[PDB]
């Protein structure tokens, strides 16, 4: 049931089929075939591509189409945070002898409680933030390509995902990941080129976006009424990075002080970020790659965000639709529709042949990303949480419970899929960053206090963590539950709660849980100094043998650099940051 749709000419059919035959080709080959050593350039480029996933294209273009240029702010916070990985959070995992921040918080506080809690928190942030967002992004791409419901589309994205996993898949990653990322950035550059051609240049985008609004502004359903021009016409400031502190969609204050709290937690504590970061031969290599990955945080603004805007100019009757009836008719959700910006742009601009390659590669990536995250949530669940409940495991038995977990989280993500669909007025970006502002800032506070206040004991961290979840859930649940609605039909939850921007609530939850940590901490017994060495910043150059806190439950450790190459790397970070800041000043 598909005819004379821009994917149904067999140039693109042959190209999509060929690529998902070549990925199973690399995979069955891989099945039968069978910390250091990565250099500045390759380990910079792995950080970049760690965050370029179809979910990013969808959301960052979509929010581009909705709000103008200031989601690009997001990305330019990222490069200052990656620098601070490369300088602050990367040395600490090197000095401590750890890899994971769970391994660090096992050495730093000691108890099985904080490992248990972060593990359960990580399960909720893969169900809410990774699995459901990836399923949703597949659904969107597929709908714009071959009109199909969300539910039918995920049935298919999970069908191809299961036959990715069982036919090699995650074994044959390094080959597939290198080639997927090369042709995503290739495809993205070609399609950007086509978008700026179609709008009539760069001058075209800027002279045409602020008038790009829809013609259909009235609803059959009364109560909605004659829809206001506040809502349907684009925002009067949408060429600027820095917005009003209080009435901005992405307030300046918030972006700076509050994305750091949340982007910080992502770069300090992700499995993939830290696992790819600690592949250098050296801290100099790590630092110089973390400089190159900044130079790759400005490409997305052109590659992802400006195409969202050109998706609004070219296709305003769909991308910028306001009326509850017309939105459902185009994107399947009353609340809005910007989410279709990047996929609609791919289907309708990229010419025959190339079109299928770009759809194939954006789809094989969600196959890989889903398969990665199912494996990762399975180990974490199978080890941390079952072992604790029942440490009597037949490894056969365990491998069942490992497989039965993946069934449960497929189902709970698919259950959650319509909340992700109309999440923040139909803005995937905002939902991702809003979930991560409700759940991250406690952990941000406990890791920035662990590592710079040695007085903070274990009682402290745990109750900081648990007192941050209750404040955070006192807004994350209440908001996904009273609905969020949108511009046309405002929400219902009150602003004693969901008034303020989610990034401002991240700032308050950061400082609040922080003080819980400090106060429970200073009312209990301190950690003795002897089992704190090369864990706190005050004791990183100590050279004194310590009697580890995890060692109580048991009964690549170099930060050297050539100072000539260290002067080189510190120069290149300061040049890159000046370049970044000038690009920010231009688009402020």
């Amino acid at each position: 049931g598909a005819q004379k749709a821009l994917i149904d000419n067999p140039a693109d059919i042959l190209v999509i089929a060929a690529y998902f035959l070549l990925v199973i080709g690399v995979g069955l080959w891989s099945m039968c075939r069978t910390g250091r050593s990565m250099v500045w350039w390759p380990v910079g480029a792995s950080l970049f591509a760690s965050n370029i996933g179809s979910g990013h294209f969808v959301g960052l273009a979509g929010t581009g189409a909705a709000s103008g240029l200031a989601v690009a702010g997001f990305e330019w916070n990222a490069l200052f945070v990656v620098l601070l990985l490369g300088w602050l959070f990367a040395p600490v995992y090197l000095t401590a002898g750890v890899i994971t921040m769970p391994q660090y918080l096992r050495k730093r506080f000691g108890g099985r409680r904080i490992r248990l809690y972060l593990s359960v928190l990580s399960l909720f942030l893969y169900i809410f933030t990774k699995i459901s967002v990836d399923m949703f992004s597949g659904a969107v791409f597929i709908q714009q390509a071959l009109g199909w419901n969300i539910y039918a589309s995920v049935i298919a994205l999970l069908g191809i995902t299961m036959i990715y996993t069982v036919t090699g898949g995650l074994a044959a990653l390094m080959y597939t990941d290198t080639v997927q990322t090369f042709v995503i950035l290739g495809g993205a550059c070609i399609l950007m080129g086509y978008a700026f051609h179609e709008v009539g240049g760069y001058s075209g985008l800027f002279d045409k976006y602020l008038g790009a609004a829809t013609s259909l502004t009235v609803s059959e359903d009364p109560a909605v009424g004659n829809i206001s021009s506040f809502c349907y016409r684009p925002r009067p400031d949408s060429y600027h990075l820095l917005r009003h502190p209080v009435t901005g969609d992405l307030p300046w204050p918030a972006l700076l002080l509050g994305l750091t709290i949340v982007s910080g937690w992502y770069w300090c504590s992700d499995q993939v970020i830290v696992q790819r970061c600690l592949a250098g031969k050296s801290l100099t290599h790590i630092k110089a790659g973390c400089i190159l990955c900044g130079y790759l945080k400005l490409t997305p603004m052109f590659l992802m965000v400006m195409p969202g805007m050109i998706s609004r100019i070219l296709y305003p009757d769909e991308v910028a639709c306001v009326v509850p009836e017309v939105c459902r008719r185009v994107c399947g959700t009353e609340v809005g529709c910007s989410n279709i910006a990047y996929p609609r742009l791919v289907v309708k601009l990229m010419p025959n042949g190339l079109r299928g390659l770009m759809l194939a590669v954006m789809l094989a990536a969600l196959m890989s990303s889903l398969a990665s995250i199912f494996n990762s949530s399975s180990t974490l669940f199978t080890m941390d949480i079952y072992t604790r409940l029942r440490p009597r495991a037949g490894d056969r038995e365990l491998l069942l419970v490992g497989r039965l977990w993946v069934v449960f989280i497929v189902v709970v993500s698919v259950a959650w899929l319509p909340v992700v669909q109309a999440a923040q007025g139909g803005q995937l970006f905002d939902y991702i960053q809003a979930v991560s502002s409700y759940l991250a800032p406690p952990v941000s506070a406990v890791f920035v206090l662990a590592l710079f206040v040695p007085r903070v004991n274990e009682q402290g961290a745990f109750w900081g963590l648990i007192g941050g979840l209750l404040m955070g859930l006192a807004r994350l649940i209440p908001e996904f539950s009273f609905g969020s609605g949108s511009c046309v039909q405002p929400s219902a939850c009150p602003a004693f709660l969901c008034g303020v921007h989610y990034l401002y609530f991240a700032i308050v939850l950061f400082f609040c849980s922080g003080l819980l940590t400090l106060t429970v901490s200073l009312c209990t017994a301190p950690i003795p100094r002897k089992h704190l060495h090369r864990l706190v910043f005050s004791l990183r150059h100590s050279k004194e043998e310590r009697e580890d806190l995890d060692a109580d439950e048991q009964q690549l450790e170099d930060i050297s650099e050539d100072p000539s190459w260290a002067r080189v790397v510190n120069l290149n970070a300061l040049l890159m940051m000046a370049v970044a800041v000038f690009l920010w000043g231009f688009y402020a």
Partner: peptide, 29 residues
């Protein structure tokens, strides 16, 4: 103009690094 706005931003940032280097030299020997 936007390029005036860019040069203002980098000028402020270099001043910010000068405050940081003065802190490291003077208050963090």
């Amino acid at each position: 103009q936007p390029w005036m706005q860019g040069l203002i931003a980098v000028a402020v940032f270099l001043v910010l690094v000068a405050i940081a280097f003065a802190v490291n030299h003077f208050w963090c020997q």
